[PDB]
């Protein structure tokens, strides 16, 4: 149970229950309940994951150690669902995300701020209109900047050379 939670925490993208757990350690009653959690972790089923947490709380967060990490585990899965979902539809209203994530709007704003500050989101937030504007970066530039830097640097270089030689 500790190992399965540990595998979740490292944001692992590999089924820990696959073969060593096999079935005696993959279908054991309380262990099977843990198998459903990592199964929801793979499918990013936030609604189903939270339902299992509340259904089996006598064996999910019963360990004080796990109870400490439930908040972080919820934060990670909500981030993963958010990151996966937000790929299309730039300029989305925040309340739509809150309804999809079944959480408060303030929590969505805090999670969005953390994701942007982690450079995982290429965009900003419009708090006045409750709006999330994402930079589509369709300009395809970043080369005119290099051209301008080259132009200015070498022209200042030429000016300095002419001034020194004269």
């Amino acid at each position: 149970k500790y190992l399965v939670l540990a595998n979740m925490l490292m944001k692992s993208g590999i089924n820990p229950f696959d073969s060593q757990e096999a079935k005696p350690y993959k279908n054991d009653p309380e262990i099977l309940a843990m198998t459903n959690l990592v199964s929801a972790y793979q499918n990013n089923d936030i609604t189903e994951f939270e339902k299992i947490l509340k259904t089996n709380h006598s064996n999910i967060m019963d360990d004080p150690f796990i109870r400490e990490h439930i908040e972080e585990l919820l934060r990670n899965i909500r981030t993963q669902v958010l990151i996966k979902l937000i790929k299309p539809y730039t300029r989305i209203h925040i309340p739509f995300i809150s309804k999809e994530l079944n959480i408060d709007v303030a929590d969505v704003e805090s999670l969005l701020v953390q994701c942007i500050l982690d450079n995982t989101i290429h965009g900003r937030i419009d708090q006045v209109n409750q709006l999330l504007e994402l930079d589509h970066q369709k300009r395809g530039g970043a080369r005119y900047t290099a051209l301008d830097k080259w132009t200015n640097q070498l022209n200042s270089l030429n000016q300095a050379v002419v001034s020194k030689l004269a």
Binding site: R143, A146, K149, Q153, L154, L157, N158, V161, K164
Partner: protein, 309 residues
């Protein structure tokens, strides 16, 4: 005289091979002139390959500091890029091919070897360096040519290099501009290493009747839509790379000039700085003419088509 280069003077070649001026200077050979025919054949063979390395032999001659490639032919060998002196497996074939070529009036002898680097640039790996070192141990005047058929297609510009090795123990002098190539992670590590190791031969080529036939026929039909956009320079990889190399060269020139102002009486530094500035200026200029010609063709054609009447 456009066709003067096609004249073969056997006695003159024998005289040059007896003189061996390349033994007096390891930087003796500076230029590589390639006929249209040879280049075309090589590119075709490499592209038929597709992602596998192929190799062949080049027939030609020497003229002063210039190595001249007149023709080429594929070798039926395995282990290009993995076997040192892989060409050796085709020895018998090479002897017969050349014998039969002499029967039909191909007089030029072996001048080098070519091989392909599909999608990993144009350079000499440790194996290539061992092979060309052996090729410059028995047949000193040998030029190694490397072609990237994949990058030729993707860049719309021929990706070819001509190289010669240094003898074991011998160190290159101060100069070595080394144009950067986008070789893969470990391939680029080894590439920096071997660009420090060998020296490139200025590609020179020569416009001829072979070239005249090709340019005329392909442009007429394969460019019925002479459009093909008009700017294959739109890819910000070649022009941008030239711009960055220009910036680095002039920055180094300024760094040298600033330190040279304290030393009073160093003429060689002034000479080198002036030469570097001039070379940078000409490179930027030629880029500018290329861009201007592209825009001119674009403007004429698109104006005509869009708003003729």
């Amino acid at each position: 005289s456009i066709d003067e280069i096609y004249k073969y003077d056997k006695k003159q070649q024998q005289e040059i091979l007896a003189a061996k001026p390349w033994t007096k200077d390891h930087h003796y050979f500076k230029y590589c002139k390639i006929s249209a025919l040879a280049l075309l054949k090589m590119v075709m063979h490499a592209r038929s390959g597709g992602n596998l390395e192929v190799m062949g032999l080049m027939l030609g001659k020497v003229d002063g500091e210039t190595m001249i490639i007149m023709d080429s032919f594929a070798l039926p060998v395995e282990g290009t890029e993995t076997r040192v002196n892989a060409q050796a497996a085709a020895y018998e074939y090479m002897a017969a091919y050349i014998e039969n070529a002499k029967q039909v009036g191909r007089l030029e002898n072996a001048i080098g070897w070519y091989h392909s680097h599909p999608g990993y640039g144009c350079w000499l790996s440790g194996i290539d360096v061992s092979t060309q070192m052996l090729n410059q141990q028995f047949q000193e005047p040998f030029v190694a040519v490397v072609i990237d058929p994949t990058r030729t297609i993707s860049a719309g510009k021929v990706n070819l290099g001509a190289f010669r090795t240094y003898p074991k123990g011998y160190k290159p002098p101060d100069e070595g501009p080394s144009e950067y190539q986008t070789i893969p992670l470990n391939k680029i590590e080894d590439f920096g290493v071997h660009c420090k190791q060998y020296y490139a031969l200025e590609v020179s080529y020569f416009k001829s009747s072979l070239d005249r036939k090709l340019l005329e026929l392909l442009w007429n039909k394969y460019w019925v839509n002479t459009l093909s956009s008009s700017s294959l320079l739109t890819n910000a990889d070649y022009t941008t790379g030239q711009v960055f190399d220009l910036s680095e060269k002039l920055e180094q020139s300024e760094a040298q000039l600033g330190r040279g102002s304290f030393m009073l009486g160093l003429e060689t530094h002034d000479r080198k700085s002036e030469d570097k500035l001039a070379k940078a200026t000409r490179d930027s200029c030629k880029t500018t003419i290329e861009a201007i010609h592209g825009l001119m063709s674009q403007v004429i054609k698109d104006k005509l088509f869009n708003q003729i009447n």
